[PDB]
Structures are given as structure tokens and as C-alpha cells.
Enzyme design. Structure first.
Site, short mmCIF file in Angstrom:
data_model
loop_
_atom_site.label_atom_id
_atom_site.label_comp_id
_atom_site.label_asym_id
_atom_site.label_seq_id
_atom_site.Cartn_x
_atom_site.Cartn_y
_atom_site.Cartn_z
CG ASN A 261 30.68 15.86 -43.59
OD1 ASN A 261 29.91 16.74 -43.93
ND2 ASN A 261 31.84 16.13 -42.97
CG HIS A 293 25.94 13.97 -31.54
ND1 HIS A 293 24.92 14.44 -30.74
CD2 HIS A 293 25.92 14.74 -32.66
CE1 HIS A 293 24.30 15.43 -31.36
NE2 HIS A 293 24.87 15.62 -32.53
CD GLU A 294 28.98 14.48 -35.08
OE1 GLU A 294 28.03 14.72 -35.86
OE2 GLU A 294 29.21 15.19 -34.09
ZN LIG Z 1 24.60 16.86 -34.27
#
Ligand SMILES: [Zn+2]
Ligand code: NA
Ligand code: NA
Ligand code: NA
Length: 866
Positions: A261, A293-294
């Protein structure tokens, strides 16, 4: 319900450009006000169909006028007779406390928080919940100050206020237009870890990591990792963060691992919280991975997003590729590659056979949450690595650049990304695009020939993708096929064709073709498919001596590991067939000799030695068979371990003592040595019982960190050693009040080779540390039973299948997303013998009968039964 098809994508009839949200928060009953600015693009007669799920509609206004031309239908609010351009105002109520599926706005402990990917924003308000509709969000949260002192949404905080009756409010604003799947909201009381990071260009970003109170001591690694990610993306891709503030909140009740997000990532607390006595080396590296990753999603997923959900791989394959590269730079590339390939071959290949088989870009989808898959993620990334392989780094980076330059601020397609890579590099990827639309694992067969008269080596390579449940029709792919050729001394022989160097990555593009190399001065031992250059099954008739030769001489560490897996695959298959007839394990001396040689080579990186002394997992072993005998495989793994424990006892113990380490550090040299030491300990557990029981319990009791504590506990369980129940009780007694640590203990319980493991697992549904409302606990116990103990799960009597059906009956009503994770063992039924298939089919037919079967389960059940 009904399927959605990729080929039916059409642009939306309306667009939203800005939305102003207000939340009057209360767990029992939250009131949402959504003012959206809309624009019709389609026909005048086209209504506006807003998605919505379990919302109580209070009022609809259009330019402040109570609207009368609307209706509620199955999952939608339909508004007619609208102007071309207008303000929409919705008020609805939702009930967070009731939300047990953790889609939308739900409660995790005392806190409120959101999950909107893929189609959860529609459980909050009536919207155009599709990721090609992007808009600028403003978010005002109102709440009880005592219970919810921190009120968080995407962007920067732009207003704040106090109210009568002990309430307060904050307002948030994210200047980047985004699709609603990237909306987040969090209210609660937290300890906050604050640092800052300064970008390459001078921009100072505030970092805030929110954790349940008292966990501020397991936060710093996560924070350091985030910082490393920001630096790495800066150095490798040139990508800087774009906002002033970066929030991450760790919650305990979460279905995924984490969520990109924008400005406000929400993380399973599994991929945040670590401390040297609660988290293993794998945990640390996974937190590094998931944080990374995020973070990388901030460009590859947010600044450019997905036009529709069939383009999920656009962001995930690329973002996984990015987390692999991050991990691989910072750590061991070889180890990283080996493990990611263990994952492809063990777990992904299995899915590409299964009734759920799909291409990385799907063509049909019933529930989208079912398509967050090994295939979309991990195979998606292999496809990206292939592009990187065909183009090279400098070219690949220019494609990334062109991609962003073209699509920054929009939603794109897989095909758009490929076009950026093609247009920037002028490598043609027309044929390559078939990887996006063909399911199944190709099988590349290699036949070789040496002609000493002419000093030429001919490779005859041929390829076929067998049919899948989802596609009857398959065609050849563009397969980058890397080779090295080794001479008698272990040197690489230079590749050429008529006195002209040839590239070592070959373009296998036809069903059959032939490559001839010149000045091949000696009959080569080849390394084929180097670094798993394509996600394919290789078929080549290795001699054992070719394989052992490669373990000694191959340039690339991965090729040594892979030579070993091929060496060992032969004998895994032998001894399964033997087991099935009551025969004991047979293994040639020279095979053990090769593993001894790896244990004693001083030249060897310990990390690599460790992976060569880690036998294939039972899932990795299963990919070797047409029909799986999970019990034979399990017993053969146990036996093979015992035989090497015996044959290598002296050397194993030597290396165990040699790599003792008084200091604990999360640094890659030290992790390599600890991994190797514990690989030795595993084997030693399976050797001489008294010596085993001694080393194992000594290491457990004396361990300063969780990596060593747990390695020993796990071997006590695996090898059925005397101290087991005691060590196992000690751990419970110490850590029961700590769910993430107990997750490991549940796994050990659930993957025990013991006789009554199912009975134990039914009982552990009552355990103090277990709860059916927490997806981590469920996966730790039930998940590990069904997914990672296939010998007990596939008991002859069907007791395993029935247990899973009981659990699934509960989880279908409570949390379909997690029920769907758990059913995967059961939809693999077409892969076992008839007697097992029948009971599995019966289990699936029972679940098909459920009053209120979820779409999540329904999709997988009707494919498997088909
Ligand atoms: Zn992902
Ligand atoms: Na828009
Ligand atoms: Na960055
Ligand atoms: Na490295």
C-alpha cells in the site's frame, strides 16, 4: 459464481479522478462517506455500476441531489441517468468486528486495519474496484483517542482535530493517483520505531515502523532492511522513493505476507519482528526479502500499476525478480539461485501439472485471490530473468527506463512491459511473448555427439510442452539455453563456429534443432541449462562420472549443486522403486565418495557445501515421479540420510566441530558456516543414537540464538531421538505466549515422522498457543500437516483427507482465502494411485456439497473434479 475472461477486458464507461473518504470508526459499526469526482466516457445510456460487498447503503447523492435513479443488485449499485461529469456522494456502514475473512476493513487484535488487494476496497464503499481506475485520495479518519491514538492512511498527514466525547481525527493526502487496491487505513495503539533515510538526490524520508506495544525490540532489523532496500533500488535501478514518509505497520492477523500500500505498507508481523533468540537466519533473510519486495513495488506496481488483474505478473514477476536480485547482491547469489530453483522445481512445476495450471498471465479467473500463485510470482520472475538473460544488464536497464518513461502514472499490461524491453534493446521478443500465454512446464531434451575427426560437438536439442488441464494446444517457446563445455582438465572450452565466437546462451526456438560447435579440442563434459536459464525440465543422459566431474570442476557454484541434484535424483528413484518392493536402500560407494569430497574440499564455499548436503525436500523429490508414493519418498529420504550419516560420520562430525562459532552475527559468511554446521548436525542426528542425542540436546540447551536452538530441536523430532519430548516441552514452556515462535513448534509437530502425528495435530487444535482465527497459526499446524507432511496426510486409510475436510468446513465460512491455501494438497489428487484418488475425489465431493461454498474453494474443487 461465473468466470471472468481476459479477452473481455474493455475500458471503463466511467472514471473517477478524486475521492474524499471519511471514516467514523468503530469496530461494531463504521460509517464511510465517499465523495468521488466522476466522468462518463461511454454511452449516455450506460449506467454507472459500482462494486460493493456487504455494505449497508445509507444514501446516494449526485451533485448534492438525493438520487432516485439507482438500484442494488447482486454485488453492485447501479446508477442511471447521470450527467457527463458529476460529484458522487455515498454514505454506507460496514462492520469491521464481524469481518473474519480479512478482506476489506477488519480488526487485528485491538487495532483496525485494511486489506484491499485484489478486490477488497469494495467491502468498504461502493466504488469502481478495478485497477485501471486511478484517482487521488484524501482520507479523514475519526475515532476514539484512547483506543485509536494513531490514525493512518496513505500519503502525508494534512489536518488534525479534537472533538467532544474523547474523539479525534486526522486527515491524509496522497498526491499520486492510485487504484483503490492500494488504499490503506490503520487505527490503533503502537510502539513506533522512527529513523530517516536520505535519498541519493538529497530527499529526506521519515521512516515509521508501527508494532504492537512491547515489540519495539524486535523492530530494528526490519528497519535496517528497509534502509538497505532503499539504497539498493537506488544503486541498481536508479529508483528513489517519491514521498516524504514511509510507514510500515505489522499486524498479527493477515492473510498475505505483506502489502505494498503506497506510503503505508501493512505487514504480517511474521515478516517484520526478529530478535536473535526468537528468529532464525531464514527469518532474517525472509524479512530482508519481504521488506525489500514491498518496497520495490513502489515503482513496479504503484508508479506503474496493472490495467486489470490478469496482468498481475506485470508487477509480481518483476517485483519478485527484484527481491531475488536484492537478496543476491547483498548475499550469496549462488545460494539464492539454488533455493529459488528448489522452489520452481519442487513446488511450481507441481502446480503447472495440476488442475489449477495457468499461464503467468491468466485467461480465466473465478476468484482473483486464487491467482496469487507460485506460477504468477516465481515463474513470472523466471520469465523476467529470461529477458534479462537474453538482453543483458545494460539493455535490461534501458527497458526498465523506457517502461517507466512511458507508463509512469498509468496502468499497463504484461505486453506493454515486453514492448518496452523489445523497443529499448532491439532484441525481438515476439516469440518470447508466448511465455505469458502458455501454461505448463516445457521439457527440453538434449542429445550430444563428439566427432574427433573434425573436432566438432553437436547438440541436438528438442522441446515439447505436454498438454495441461487448462490448454489442449501447446507450441514451442523461445528458450534461452545456457551451456559451458568442460575439457579433461576442467577448463572451459571456448564456443565457436567457423573461427567466430558463439554466444553461450543458445536460442532453442523450434521443436527440434541442432547446434554444432568447432575447435572442440577434447570430448566435453557439458553443463546444460546453466543457472536454470529457463523454467524447464531438462532431459539428458548423464553418466555419474559426468555428474561427479561437474561437482569438482564447474565454474559456477550453481552448476555444482545442480550436478549433485541430478546425481542424487537417479538414486532417489531407484530406492523408491526398491522401497515399494520391501528392499533396503542401495547406493554406490562412488556416490557417497562425491558427497565426502564436497565435505572435505577446503576450496568450497561453506554455503554451497551446505546446499549440496541438504537433500531435496519431499516435494522436490515428488517432481521426479509420474505417480507419487509419498510414503516411499518419505522413508527413502530418511534412509538416504541414515546411509550418508553412516558413510560420512567421521567427516560430518569434523566439519560440525570445525564451524563452531562463539559469536552470533547476521552476516552472510557466518550464516553460511552455521548452515553447514547444522546440515552436518542433521545427518549426525540420523547416525549413532547416543552420540546424536548428546550433540542435539547439548546444542539445543547451549544455543545463544534461534537458528541453532531450532536446528537441533528439529533434528530431535526428525530423527525421533530420546530427548525429543523434553526439548519439545521446554520450548512450549518458554515460548507459548509468543505466536511467531510457536509457529515453528507447530510445524515440527505437524511434520513429525511419528506414528500418531494426526492424533497429535487434532489435539493441538486445543493448544494454548493455537487459534483458528489467526491465519499464521492455521498454516503452521494444519497447513504444515497437509502441505509438508505428505506421508501422514496421505495415510492409506484416508484419515488425513477427512481431517482436512473438517477444517475446510470451518474455514470455508470463516476465511476462504486461507481455506483455499489449505485445499491445494487435495486438488493434486490426479497425481497419486487410484485408491488414493478415490478418497480424495470423495473428500472434494463432500466439500462441493457445502451450504455456502465460497468461490475461492469452488474454483479449485470444480477444476479438480473435472
Ligand atoms: Zn508483490
Ligand atoms: Na482516473
Ligand atoms: Na530507492
Ligand atoms: Na553477492
Amino acid at each position: 459464481p461465473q468466470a471472468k475472461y481476459r479477452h473481455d477486458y474493455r475500458a471503463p464507461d466511467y472514471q473517477i479522478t478524486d475521492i474524499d473518504l471519511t471514516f467514523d470508526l468503530d469496530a461494531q459499526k463504521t460509517v464511510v462517506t465517499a465523495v468521488s469526482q466522476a466522468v462518463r466516457h461511454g454511452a449516455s445510456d450506460a449506467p454507472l455500476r459500482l462494486n460493493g460487498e456487504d455494505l449497508k447503503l445509507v444514501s446516494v447523492h449526485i451533485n448534492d441531489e438525493p438520487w432516485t435513479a439507482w438500484k442494488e443488485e447482486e454485488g453492485a449499485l447501479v446508477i442511471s441517468n447521470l450527467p457527463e461529469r458529476f460529484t458522487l456522494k455515498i454514505i454506507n456502514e460496514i462492520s469491521p468486528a464481524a469481518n473474519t475473512a480479512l478482506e476489506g476493513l477488519y480488526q487485528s487484535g485491538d487495532a483496525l486495519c485494511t486489506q484491499c488487494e485484489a478486490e477488497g476496497f469494495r467491502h468498504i464503499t461502493y466504488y469502481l474496484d478495478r485497477p485501471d481506475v486511478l484517482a487521488r485520495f484524501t482520507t479523514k479518519i475519526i475515532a476514539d483517542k484512547i483506543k485509536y491514538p494513531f490514525l493512518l492512511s496513505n500519503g502525508n498527514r494534512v489536518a488534525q482535530g479534537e472533538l467532544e466525547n474523547g474523539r479525534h481525527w486526522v486527515q491524509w493526502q496522497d498526491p499520486f493517483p492510485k487504484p483503490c487496491y492500494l488504499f490503506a487505513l490503520v487505527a490503533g495503539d503502537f510502539d513506533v520505531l522512527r529513523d530517516t533515510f536520505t535519498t541519493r538526490s538529497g530527499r529526506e524520508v521519515a521512516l515509521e515502523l508501527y508494532v504492537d506495544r512491547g515489540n519495539l525490540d524486535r523492530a530494528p532489523w526490519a528497519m535496517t532492511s528497509l534502509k538497505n532496500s532503499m539504497k539498493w533500488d537506488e544503486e541498481r535501478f536508479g529508483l528513489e522513493y517519491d514521498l516524504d514518509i514511509y510507514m510500515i505497520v505489522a499486524v498479527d492477523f493477515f492473510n498475505a505476507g505483506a502489502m505494498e500500500n503506497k506510503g503505508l505498507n501493512i505487514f504480517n508481523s511474521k515478516y517484520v519482528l526478529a530478535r536473535t533468540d526468537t528468529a532464525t537466519d531464514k527469518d532474517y533473510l525472509d524479512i530482508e526479502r519481504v521488506i525489500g519486495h514491498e518496497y520495490f513495488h513502489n515503482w513496479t506496481g504503484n508508479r506503474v500499476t496493472c490495467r486489470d488483474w490478469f496482468q498481475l505478473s506485470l508487477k509480481e514477476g518483476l517485483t519478485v525478480f527484484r527481491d531475488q536480485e536484492f537478496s543476491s547482491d547483498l548475499g550469496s547469489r549462488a545460494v539464492n539461485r539454488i533455493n529459488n530453483v528448489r522452489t520452481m522445481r519442487g513446488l511450481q512445476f507441481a502446480e503447472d501439472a495440476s488442475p489449477m495450471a495457468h499461464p503467468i498471465r491468466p485467461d480465466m479467473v473465478i476468484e482473483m485471490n486464487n491467482f496469487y500463485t507460485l506460477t504468477v510470482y516465481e515463474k513470472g520472475a523466471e520469465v523476467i530473468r529470461m529477458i534479462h538473460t537474453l538482453l543483458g544488464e545494460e539493455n535490461f536497464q534501458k527497458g526498465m527506463q523506457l517502461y517507466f518513461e512511458r507508463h509512469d502514472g498509468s496502468a499497463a499490461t504484461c505486453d506493454d512491459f515486453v514492448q518496452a524491453m523489445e523497443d529499448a534493446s532491439n532484441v525481438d521478443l515476439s516469440h518470447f511473448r508466448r511465455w505469458y500465454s502458455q501454461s505448463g512446464t516445457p521439457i527440453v531434451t538434449v542429445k550430444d555427439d563428439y566427432n574427433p575427426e573434425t573436432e566438432q560437438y553437436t547438440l541436438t536439442i528438442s522441446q515439447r510442452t505436454p498438454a495441461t488441464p487448462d490448454q489442449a494446444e501447446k507450441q514451442p517457446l523461445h528458450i534461452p539455453f545456457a551451456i559451458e563445455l568442460y575439457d579433461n582438465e576442467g577448463k572451459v572450452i571456448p564456443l565457436q563456429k567457423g573461427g567466430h565466437p558463439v554466444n553461450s546462451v543458445l536460442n532453442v526456438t523450434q521443436a527440434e534443432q541442432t547446434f554444432v560447435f568447432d575447435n572442440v579440442y577434447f570430448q566435453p563434459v557439458p553443463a546444460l541449462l546453466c543457472e536454470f536459464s529457463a523454467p524447464v525440465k531438462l532431459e539428458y543422459k548423464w553418466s555419474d562420472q559426468q555428474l561427479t566431474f561437474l561437482m569438482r570442476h564447474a565454474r559456477n557454484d550453481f552448476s555444482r549443486w545442480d550436478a549433485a541434484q541430478s546425481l542424487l535424483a537417479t538414486y532417489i528413484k531407484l530406492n523408491v522403486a526398491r522401497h515399494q518392493q520391501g528392499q533396503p536402500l542401495s547406493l554406490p560407494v562412488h556416490v557417497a565418495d562425491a558427497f565426502r569430497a564436497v565435505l572435505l574440499d577446503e576450496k568450497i564455499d561453506p554455503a554451497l557445501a551446505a546446499e549440496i548436503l541438504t537433500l531435496p525436500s519431499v516435494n522436490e523429490m515428488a517432481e521426479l515421479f509420474d505417480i507419487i508414493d509419498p510414503i516411499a519418498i518419505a522413508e527413502v529420504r530418511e534412509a538416504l540420510t541414515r546411509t550418508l550419516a553412516t558413510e560420512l560420520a567421521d567427516e560430518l562430525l569434523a566439519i560440525y566441530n570445525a564451524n563452531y562459532q562463539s559469536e552470533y552475527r547476521v552476516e552472510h559468511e557466518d550464516i553460511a558456516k552455521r548452515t553447514l554446521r547444522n546440515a552436518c548436525l542433521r545427518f549426525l542426528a540420523f547416525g549413532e543414537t547416543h552420540l546424536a542425542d548428546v550433540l542435539v540436546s547439548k546444542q539445543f540447551h547451549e544455543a545463544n540464538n534461534m537458528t541453532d536452538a531450532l536446528a537441533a530441536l528439529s533434528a530431535a523430532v526428525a530423527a525421533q531421538l530420546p530427548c525429543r519430548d523434553a526439548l519439545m516441552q521446554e520450548y512450549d514452556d518458554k515460548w507459548h505466549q509468543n505466536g511467531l515462535v510457536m509457529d515453528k513448534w507447530f510445524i515440527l509437530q505437524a511434520t513429525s515422522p511419528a506414528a500418531n502425528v494426526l492424533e497429535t495435530v487434532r489435539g493441538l487444535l486445543q493448544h494454548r498457543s493455537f487459534t483458528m482465527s489467526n491465519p499464521n497459526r492455521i498454516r503452521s499446524l494444519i497447513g504444515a500437516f497437509a502441505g509438508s507432511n505428505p506421508a501422514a496426510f496421505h495415510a492409506e486409510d484416508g484419515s488425513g483427507y477427512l481431517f482436512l475436510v473438517e477444517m475446510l468446513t470451518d474455514l470455508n465460512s470463516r476465511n476462504p482465502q486461507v481455506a483455499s491455501r489449505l485445499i491445494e494438497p487435495l486438488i493434486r489428487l490426479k497425481r497419486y494411485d487410484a485408491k488414493r484418488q478415490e478418497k480424495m475425489r470423495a473428500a472434494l465431493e463432500q466439500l462441493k456439497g457445502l451450504e455456502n461454498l465460497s468461490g475461492d474453494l469452488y474454483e479449485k474443487i470444480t477444476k479438480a473434479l473435472a
